[PDB]
Amino acid sequence: EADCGLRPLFEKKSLEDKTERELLESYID
Amino acid sequence: IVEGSDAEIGMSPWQVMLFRKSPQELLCGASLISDRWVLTAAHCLLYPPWDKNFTENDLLVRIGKHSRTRYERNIEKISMLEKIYIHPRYNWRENLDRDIALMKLKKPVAFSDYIHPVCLPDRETAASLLQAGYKGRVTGWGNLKETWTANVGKGQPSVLQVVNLPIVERPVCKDSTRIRITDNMFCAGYKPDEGKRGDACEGDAGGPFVMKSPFNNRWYQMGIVSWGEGCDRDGKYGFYTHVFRLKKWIQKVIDQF
Numbered sequence A: 001e002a003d004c005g006l007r008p009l010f011e012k013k014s015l016e017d018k019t020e021r022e023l024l025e026s027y028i029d
Numbered sequence B: 001i002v003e004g005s006d007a008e009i010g011m012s013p014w015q016v017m018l019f020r021k022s023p024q025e026l027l028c029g030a031s032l033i034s035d036r037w038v039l040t041a042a043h044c045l046l047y048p049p050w051d052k053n054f055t056e057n058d059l060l061v062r063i064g065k066h067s068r069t070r071y072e073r074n075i076e077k078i079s080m081l082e083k084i085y086i087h088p089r090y091n092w093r094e095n096l097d098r099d100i101a102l103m104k105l106k107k108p109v110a111f112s113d114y115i116h117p118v119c120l121p122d123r124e125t126a127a128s129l130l131q132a133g134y135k136g137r138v139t140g141w142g143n144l145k146e147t148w149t150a151n152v153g154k155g156q157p158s159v160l161q162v163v164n165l166p167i168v169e170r171p172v173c174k175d176s177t178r179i180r181i182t183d184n185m186f187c188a189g190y191k192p193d194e195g196k197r198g199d200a201c202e203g204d205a206g207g208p209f210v211m212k213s214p215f216n217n218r219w220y221q222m223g224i225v226s227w228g229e230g231c232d233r234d235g236k237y238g239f240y241t242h243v244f245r246l247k248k249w250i251q252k253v254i255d256q257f
């Protein structure tokens, strides 16, 4: 499924943005 | 966007500014889904009650943007539009059913650190992501607080903004408005009994509602900023065009050009 959805400055570099932990907490909280 | 932080550089690289030519004006948000195609709301391009109807030489799209009090040289690329595709069954009369449009760029866009397409969901991804209590992400340069009249005005941010919103149960979506909802749309945002704020506002329409798959690490666009009553009102939720239910129409247009 293409190069879609994976960010060069983040996912490609193994880096997180400031607010994404909030989104992933929603799959648990 | 109400109650959001300033976005980081390349945080939402699929984000597209829809722009008017005559005169110079931001109209809506939008998203990059390939190199030739942009995903936006239909009401951004077509609204008869206000005599709104745009052609290809009236509009202009800007990808890879961050600021707005700045023209970002060698960072933002500006594409011209070739053709506009609006859903035939798009109801502008009542509820904005099938509020979805597609726009083929004249020339393909080169991908960089700041320009990169989002993924569109299928069945399995939709079933594991679209659940009430799950948080998605809305992006835009729209107003920060509820405006008095029904479009873009004074109260803009200088930089792209980002907010995270929980998906809401259908019954609550329905009981939040007298407007007759459909299944081609979902609603998102916090409840009175939740004490966290945020909503899309004017100038954000068309922009993406995205979610990151916890398994495969890819970002998927589950929604398009469509409509709401006010901005960030208690007991009100923003309604987003259900992107998967309309993946059948999108697949048709892209494959038929």
Ligand SMILES: C[C@@H]1CNc2c(cccc2S(=O)(=O)N[C@@H](CCCNC(=N)N)C(=O)N2CC[C@@H](C)C[C@@H]2C(=O)O)C1
Pocket (backbone or CB within 6 Å): B043, B047, B094, B095, B096, B149, B150, B151, B152, B179, B199, B200, B201, B202, B203, B205, B225, B226, B227, B228, B229, B230, B231, B232, B237, B238, B239
């Ligand atoms: C089925 C919609 C419901 N609402 C409205 C309609 C028509 C005129 C004005 C409104 S509004 O100002 O109450 N709400 C705006 C603002 C909503 C923004 N807030 C969100 N939480 N998303 C709106 O829906 N729209 C969508 C239709 C366009 C034409 C105007 C305006 C917008 O610019 O977003 C029909």
Ligand code: NA
Pocket (backbone or CB within 6 Å): B189, B190, B191, B199, B232, B233, B234, B235, B236, B237
């Ligand atoms: Na709300």
